[PDB]
Ligand SMILES: CC(=O)c1ccc(-c2cc(NS(=O)(=O)c3ccc(C)cc3C)c(C(=O)O)s2)s1
């Protein structure tokens with residue numbers, strides 16, 4: 001079974017595409033080596049098509065079935081509700097792709113009769129037809145990176161009407177089931193601090209810890225019909241209304257298992273027989289399937305007390321070491337088993353004995369010290385991509401503000417604090433847009449956030465320690481300094497000066513702005529302040545922020 005089959009029609013763009021970093025009067029203050037940054041375009045779609053097109057083979061043994069039976073037993077305890085049309089509509093992002101049937105995200109969010117009527121019609125069709133493949137659009141994603149160039153990734157999604165129907169039938173399922181089936185192993189239930197806490201405690205739970213990350217080669221393409229039907233059988237274990245059962249069966253047969261691909265010009269590009277990257281179940285399905293295969297593989301490889309952390313296709317395993325030589329052999333067997341389950345590795349997995357050396361979800365655990373000198377572990381990552389994207393956002397407004405999402409997720413880091421916060425608050429101040437809400441993404445879901453609320457948000461997600469970390473590790477320091485040299489990003493003395501300036505402007509503004517100045521830039525002054533809990537913090541409603549992953553799920557909140 002080929003992951004895809006093609007007709008020859010090109011994967012066309014839906015709008016003008018820029019590959020080179022746009023430059024304005026602000027660019028240089030952040031990055032000088034402009035030619036290092038680029039954005040992927042449909043022009044490289046061909047290359048990607050060749051990488052994601054291959055045959056899949058699967059040999060399922062008793063370990064696989066034993067793990068599956070256990071997962072289904074847990075899924076049976078779940079009771080999920082069918083969402084109402086209005087509820088599903090409110091979860092639609094304001095700028096989500098418009099329907100091909102005469103209405104857009106705006107009409108959906110406002111519950112217009114035209115949109116609500118078509119949605120209802122699509123729903124009825126799902127109930128009465130469980131065989132006809134549903135159309136999907138295939139587009140080349142425009143993503144920014146630093147060279148040393150990768151081809152654009154591909155996104156496959158059904159019409160807006162179908163997406164609302166997916167929410168109605170499955171939102172409650174994909175939001176509640178993974179945590180029940182996988183418990184503490186389900187990664188999306190954790191905020192960055194909780195993820196670090198889980199990784200550290202798990203590591204400490206082993207007499208002689210050993211860990212490794214497992215990178216599957218183009219995971220979506222390795223997902224087979226069997227995998228997708230297996231996922232449906234797990235969903236069906238839930239206590240569901242009969243109408244929901246029918247809808248899930250229908251969406252599985254007509255959309256999740258596969259279907260035709262249509263480019264932006266309306267031409268048939270081919271056919272998909274693997275995971276669709278732009279459906280509501282993409283994250284939950286990848287997570288369940290990755291966890292199923294990995295769990296079974298741990299048994300085949302005989303790993304001791306293998307604890308796992310799964311986020312979609314991202315997998316991290318921490319177990320009890322049985323000796324260096326043996327761990328290496330076990331990992332080999334693990335990879336062989338994963339391969340038999342149609343989850344071949346991209347990069348061969350290697351055993352690590354230093355927690356901080358394991359990268360998962362493009363991040364790693366590191367350590368610093370708080371105002372009290374106490375050791376504190378936090379999540380960080382290589383800042384190259386975040387900075388390249390920040391450069392792009394410096395001269396171009398985008399649907400998703402990566403800089404804001406990165407400040408929220410990596411607030412305790414040296415780079416997010418010194419550069420991202422300083423640079424963007426400087427711009428927000430000059431343009432008087434501090435109070436303007438911006439969209440960013442957390443675990444795949446889109447959120448509208450006011451920059452002025454960052455202090456509270458950071459306090460709630462990372463704790464006051466995020467505003468006073470210091471004495472970072474040499475490893476982290478060198479990686480940050482190397483990245484800055486590579487990109488041609490100005491040094492500390494420059495950022496410290498800009499930070500003091502920004503901090504002074506914010507303080508004068510008063511209100512929330514002053515709070516931003518005091519907490520976000522305390523590191524920039526020589527005579528540090530108090531920094532005590534923020535009252536308004538408790539006000540913020542962060543429920544649903546770290547519950548589940550919705551990558552490509554077309555999900556919006558507030
Ligand atoms: C290349 C480069 O600019 C740098 C390399 C290492 C640097 C570092 C500056 C520090 N100290 S600091 O100047 O007080 C500082 C600056 C900025 C923030 C957000 C926090 C703190 C505590 C470091 C540390 O304490 O570990 S590492 S700065």
Ligand SMILES: CC(=O)c1ccc(-c2cc(NS(=O)(=O)c3ccc(C)cc3C)c(C(=O)O)s2)s1
Nearest residue numbers: 470471472477478480481482490491492493494
């Ligand atoms: C307290 C603390 O750890 C720090 C305070 C300021 C730091 C800084 C370290 C730097 N550079 S470095 O690449 O890390 C570096 C290069 C060469 C040597 C010989 C040493 C270093 C550290 C800074 C800068 O470039 O502005 S500030 S690091």
